[PDB]
């Protein structure tokens, strides 16, 4: 009955770039989401699954935590049925998604005075992502009928673009750490309870 190590997810010193979003399994432990919900530290705590407090009475076979950093205006894209650059090319939730999306304001940590360019997002892809797909390719994006020679210049571009995260950014342009908690009921005894 070990307590789930939520601090390893929510208190993490570093977060993955959204183009290569981190994934961690939570299993065989005692969850507490009420401590998160009542922390009042989160700018957003929204469930598309069971309501934020009703879920505390439920057991699951597992929970997955998807961790990444995006602009505050992009937080709305982290939902089922959404479109836009993050929803289509970096991270996608299925229309059948069950779980919750939690956002935290990291402007005091992830921003840098000259700008923090270590957080990357995908700008180009040949097609939209499948739900929970993680595309980490760095291959130069091709456009047009002419084959790309692997060298940037015209109709050849690096697929990723950095965020310009700075302390002076308006709230919509401030970085937010986002954790998506996906819940599953597999044909197995539950391993996660609270």
């Amino acid at each position: 009955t070990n307590l789930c190590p939520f601090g390893e997810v929510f208190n993490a010193t570093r977060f993955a770039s959204v183009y290569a979003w981190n994934r961690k399994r939570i299993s065989n432990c005692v969850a507490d989401y009420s401590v998160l919900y009542n922390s009042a530290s989160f700018s957003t705590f929204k469930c598309y699954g069971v309501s934020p407090t009703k879920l505390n009475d439920l057991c699951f076979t597992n929970v997955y935590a998807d961790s990444f950093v995006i602009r505050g205006d992009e937080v709305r894209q982290i939902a089922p049925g959404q479109t836009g650059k993050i929803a289509d090319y970096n991270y996608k939730l299925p229309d059948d998604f069950t779980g919750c999306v939690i956002a935290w304001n990291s402007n005091n940590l992830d921003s840098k005075v000259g700008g923090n360019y270590n957080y990357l997002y995908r700008l180009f892809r040949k097609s939209n992502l499948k739900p929970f797909e993680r595309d980490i390719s760095t291959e130069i994006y091709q456009a047009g009928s002419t084959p790309c020679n692997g060298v940037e210049g015209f109709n050849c571009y690096f697929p990723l673009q950095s965020y310009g995260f700075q302390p002076t950014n308006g709230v919509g342009y401030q970085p937010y750490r986002v954790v998506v908690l996906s819940f599953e009921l597999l044909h197995a005894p539950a391993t996660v309870c609270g």
Partner: antibody, heavy 122, light 109 residues
Framework: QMQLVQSGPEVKKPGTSVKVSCKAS????????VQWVRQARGQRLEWIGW????????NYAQKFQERVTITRDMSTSTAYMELSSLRSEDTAVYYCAAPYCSSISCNDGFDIWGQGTMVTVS | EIVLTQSPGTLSLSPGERATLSCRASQSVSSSYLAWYQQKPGQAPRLLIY???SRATGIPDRFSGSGSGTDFTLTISRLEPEDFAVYYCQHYGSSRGWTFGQGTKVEIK
């Protein structure tokens, strides 16, 4: 039908700055890139710089290094260029150009040019 | 920056005659970044050839690009009144390029 529409003529004093706009229409702006070229009357075309719309990335000719800045605003579907420290030698017609872009792919050359903007320095 | 030059700077031909325009790079890079443009007085430049050989949409069959490496050409099988214009070549490169040649003109003889 794709077209580019540029801002109209303007007259500036030396030592001042000028801004020229180029509005997109009829094609996918985000997949495109915009090139800026200027031509003095009777003279050869001179490249100034270019911008990739999706990334905002730019490059400039060494002659215009830190004299020209190219920006874009996708919500206005418009490319913008600014030139500083104007000289009488900078009098020219300024043009924007871009490849046609479908939702699938873009052309491999600058098939569409704007009508041009006259800029006079005196 | 790569320097492009053109020759002849001026040509004089009668309508119906074959014409050839040429250019030379200070160094070879690739045919994939070459394009040719046509200009008339009072008008913006218009794309004729890209990829050093492909026709732009709406371009007549008489126009074709050619050559390779350092030396590229643009040819017209027979001149029409519409074809008397100033022509330019451009090299896109890997960027930090995009230079234009000196230009060439075809006059009516």
């Amino acid at each position: 039908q794709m077209q580019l529409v540029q801002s109209g003529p303007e007259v500036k004093k030396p030592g001042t700055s000028v801004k020229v706009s180029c509005k997109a229409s009829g094609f996918t702006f985000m997949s495109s890139a915009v090139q800026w070229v200027r031509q003095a009357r009777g003279q050869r075309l001179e490249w100034i710089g270019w911008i990739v719309i999706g990334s905002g990335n730019t490059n400039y000719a060494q002659k215009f290094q830190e004299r020209v800045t190219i920006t874009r605003d996708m919500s206005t579907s418009t490319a913008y260029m600014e030139l500083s420290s104007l000289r009488s030698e900078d009098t020219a017609v300024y043009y924007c150009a871009a490849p046609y872009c479908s939702s699938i792919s873009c052309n491999d050359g600058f098939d569409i040019w704007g009508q041009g903007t006259m800029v006079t320095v005196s | 920056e790569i320097v492009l030059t053109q020759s002849p700077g001026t040509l004089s031909l009668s309508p119906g005659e074959r014409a050839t325009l040429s250019c030379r790079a200070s160094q070879s890079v690739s045919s994939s970044y070459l394009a040719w443009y046509q200009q008339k007085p009072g008008q913006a430049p218009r794309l004729l050839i890209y990829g050093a050989s492909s026709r732009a949409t709406g371009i007549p069959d008489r126009f074709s690009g050619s050559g390779s490496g350092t030396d590229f050409t643009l040819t017209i099988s027979r001149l029409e009144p519409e074809d008397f214009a100033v022509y330019y070549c451009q090299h896109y490169g890997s960027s930090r390029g995009w230079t234009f040649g000196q230009g060439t003109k075809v006059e009516i003889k």
